[PDB]
A paper describes a structure:
Our work focuses on the biopolymer poly-β(1,6)-N-acetyl-D-glucosamine (PNAG), which is produced by numerous pathogenic organisms. Deacetylation of PNAG by the N-terminal domain of PgaB is a critical step in polymer maturation and is required for the formation of robust biofilms. Herein, we show that the C-terminal domain of PgaB is a glycoside hydrolase active on partially deacetylated PNAG, and that the enzyme disrupts PNAG-dependent biofilms and potentiates killing by antibiotics.
Diffraction data were collected to 1.76 Å resolution and the structure was determined by molecular replacement. Examination of the crystal packing in the asymmetric unit revealed two Bb-GH molecules packed in a head to head fashion. We do not believe this assembly is biologically relevant as size exclusion chromatography shows that Bb-GH elutes as a monomer in solution. Bb-GH adopts a (β/α)8 barrel fold observed in GH13 family members, and also common to a wide range of other glycoside hydrolases families. There is also a defined pocket at the center of the groove. This central pocket and most of the electrostatic groove contain residues that are highly conserved among orthologues. Taken together, the mutagenesis data suggests that residues D326, D328, D364, and E585 play a role in substrate binding as the asparagine or glutamine mutants displayed detectable activity, while D474 is the most probable residue to be involved in catalysis as it is the only residue whose activity is ablated in both the asparagine and alanine variants. Considering that neither PgaBBb nor PgaBEc have sequence or structural similarity to the active site to DspB or other closely related GH family members, we propose that the C-terminal domain of PgaB defines a new GH family, GH153.
Numbering used by the authors: 318 to 670
Write the structure that this text describes.
């Protein structure tokens, strides 16, 4: 079994001119037919500002405005014309519902964070410990399942909690239920409690995504609903950092069909990108995770706003192959600018590899 995946932004397809939008879609379909990946991870939410404040999505639903009714038709065209599997890529927590929504303002709190700033996680993450936020997110996933036909779910990288979160009253009450004091200062001060708390939050988020899976699978009438989740590299390279990510490679491997590991040394600011990738693969191997870890590479340098040379991307794929990491893919597909170069990547993205 081999996965070769392409993650695709509907933000790149969308255009206020529906005829331009159609031309955009056409270019995507042609590239995916040519490249023939195992799966496309398809954005179901809108994030055109790139700040992770998700006020709109691309499917009809009860809670958020629709930017365009686009996910269902792109998913169907990918499936039927390009012959690929399609995963719905959706946030776990970040839904900026309108005022008057029951979940409005029921967000993840931090003991130290102030207004007007953020850490890795978005300030807009709804608290999965709050019953109204829990239900609203559940209903958004239900509405996705009603609105479109797809083969899997990719749970987004927005599902993070740091070591000062979640400090909201509902979260504290949940920690008390785990046998911890409802007091993050007290938890953090005791290394044993701090470890238990970190692992507890990791499992809580995973369990929440399993709840969402159950909702979607019931509606897709499909027990074979495959799930993947984005995993940051730092918890893999340095597992102590689980405590301020709320993610874990061993726990992910136990719970998801695939782990979408963000193998992106450029984004990470790696001084020695080849060594970095070598160490990342070794870490995954050490956890016996190569069979279900997808090394998701970056095709764009988002910080400087430039495509990454396709030859650099291919060299990363060849390096992965040489190390026995046979599942991989890239994000994003810039189908309008023909980047990455499909001709150059075809041989390594082929499922005969």
């Amino acid at each position: 079994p081999i996965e070769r995946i392409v993650q695709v932004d509907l933000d790149y397809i969308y255009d206020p001119d529906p005829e331009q939008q159609n031309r955009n879609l056409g270019q995507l379909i042609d590239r995916m037919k040519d490249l023939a990946p195992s799966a496309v991870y398809l954005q179901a939410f809108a994030d055109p500002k790139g700040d992770g404040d998700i006020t709109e999505v691309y499917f009809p639903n009860r809670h958020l405005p629709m930017r365009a009714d686009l996910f269902n038709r792109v998913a169907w065209q990918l499936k039927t014309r390009a012959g690929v599997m399609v995963y719905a890529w959706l946030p776990v927590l970040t839904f900026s519902v309108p005022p008057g929504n029951p979940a409005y303002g029921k967000v993840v709190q931090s003991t130290t964070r102030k207004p007007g700033e953020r850490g890795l996680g978005s300030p807009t993450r709804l608290s999965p410990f709050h019953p109204d936020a829990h239900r609203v997110i559940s209903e958004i996933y239900e509405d996705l399942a009603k609105a479109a036909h797809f083969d899997g779910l990719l749970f987004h990288d927005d599902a993070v909690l740091d070591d000062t979160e979640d400090s909201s009253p509902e979260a504290l009450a949940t920690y008390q239920g785990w046998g911890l004091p409802p007091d993050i200062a007290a938890i953090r001060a005791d290394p044993k409690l701090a470890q238990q708390w970190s692992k507890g939050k990791i499992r809580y988020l995973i369990d929440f995504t399993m709840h969402l899976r159950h909702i979607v699978s019931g509606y897709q009438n499909d027990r074979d609903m495959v799930v993947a989740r984005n995993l940051y590299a730092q918890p893999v390279l340095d597992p102590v950092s689980e405590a301020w990510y709320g993610q874990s490679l061993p726990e992910f491997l136990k719970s998801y069909d695939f782990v979408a590991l963000m193998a992106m040394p450029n984004m990470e600011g790696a001084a020695r990108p080849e060594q970095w990738m070598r160490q990342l693969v070794a870490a995954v191997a050490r956890q016996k995770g190569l069979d279900r870890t997808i090394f998701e590479l970056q095709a764009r340098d988002w910080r400087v706003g430039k495509p990454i040379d396709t030859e650099i991307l291919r060299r990363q794929m060849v390096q992965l192959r040489s190390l026995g990491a046979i599942n991989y893919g890239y994000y994003p597909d810039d189908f309008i600018a023909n980047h990455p170069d499909a001709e150059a990547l075809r041989d390594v993205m082929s499922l005969k590899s």
